[PDB]
Design a protein around this ligand. Structure first.
Ligand SMILES: Cc1cc2nc3c(=O)[nH]c(=O)nc-3n(C[C@H](O)[C@H](O)[C@H](O)COP(=O)(O)OP(=O)(O)OC[C@H]3O[C@@H](n4cnc5c(N)ncnc54)[C@H](O)[C@@H]3O)c2cc1C
Length: 270
């Protein structure tokens, strides 16, 4: 159809048309593409760049839509709002996130894309560029390991959806979704729906820093056992995809990946 993100260098103002309070911090923000038949123009695996001049300082932060290029007229972004005066070190909270919460209906925010090193080309085929200028290295995988932390499910979900939507895409997605509390399990219905509908291909497990009284899943930070039991066996040569808070990736993921047997080259951070 009509691509909204025609140029990666042009910022495209889109209007906010709906907001869904996914959780206390994270909200699903729907934006209106230029035409009701216009598409976003986002290859699976890539992300967009929201740009706005907040506090006199142009702040450009990146977000991965939960919408699919199949969806027309709208762009759904599950964005967590780091609230002000809710963190001891950060009384100013998030910058773009708080602007987005403040955004009323019909306010405009600029979009830029596509941007990203990973593109899913279908049926195991992941085009991962080592650098933005270097050419993408293409590797077909039978399983995809995925470690998502909080708002880092949106890049995973994009991939999960694409694979499950193609019945000839036999790649098997293993997801490890790490959040602080049960209330913080974003897109949990969608995810559980995906698993029920495509169990053979989608394997789902959660970990919560502070779990509820009844947690049939896992507790604590990301650990080696959960990477071992709830991600693909390293022998299957899978692709471990990771999005989470930089600390979580550095201290909980990358270390415990080595322990299980996953190589750095078979692993990618969104
Ligand atoms: C590929 C990709 C996709 C992404 N997709 C999404 C997405 O879909 N949705 C999304 O929300 N984010 C997404 N992010 C992350 C996003 O860019 C930000 O991390 C954040 O959501 C908004 O930025 P900000 O300007 O609000 O943060 P900043 O203001 O730049 O954050 C500054 C620091 O303050 C901390 N901080 C501030 N207040 C608090 C608080 N109350 N509690 C804890 N820490 C606090 C932050 O954690 C951070 O360390 C994505 C990132 C990447 C790389």
């Amino acid at each position: 159809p009509a691509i909204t993100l025609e140029s990666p260098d042009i910022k495209y103002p889109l209007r906010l048309i709906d907001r869904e309070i996914i959780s206390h911090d994270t909200r699903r923000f729907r934006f209106a593409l230029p035409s009701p038949q216009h598409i976003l123009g986002l290859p699976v695996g890539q992300h967009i760049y929201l740009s706005a001049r907040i506090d006199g300082n142009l702040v450009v932060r990146p977000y991965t839509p939960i919408s699919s290029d199949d969806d027309k007229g709208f762009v759904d972004l599950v964005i967590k709002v780091y609230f002000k005066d809710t963190h001891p070190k950060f009384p100013a909270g998030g910058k773009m996130s708080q602007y987005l919460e403040s955004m009323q209906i019909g306010d405009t925010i600029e979009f830029r894309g596509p941007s990203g090193l990973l593109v899913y080309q279908g049926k195991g085929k992941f085009a991962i560029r080592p650098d933005k200028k270097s050419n993408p290295i293409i590797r077909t995988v039978k399983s995809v390991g995925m470690i998502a932390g909080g708002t880092g499910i949106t890049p995973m979900l994009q991939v999960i959806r694409a694979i499950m939507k193609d019945p000839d895409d036999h790649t098997v997605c293993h997801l490890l979704f790490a959040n602080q509390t049960e209330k913080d399990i974003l897109l949990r219905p969608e995810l559980e729906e995906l698993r029920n509908k495509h169990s053979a291909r989608f394997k789902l497990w959660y970990t919560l820093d502070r779990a509820p009284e009844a947690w049939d899943y896992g507790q604590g930070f990301v650990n080696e056992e959960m990477i071992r039991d709830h991600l693909p066996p390293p022998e299957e040569e899978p692709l471990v995809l990771m999005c989470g808070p930089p600390p979580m990736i550095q201290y909980a993921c990358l270390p415990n990946l080595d322990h299980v047997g996953h190589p750095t080259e078979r692993c990618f951070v969104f």
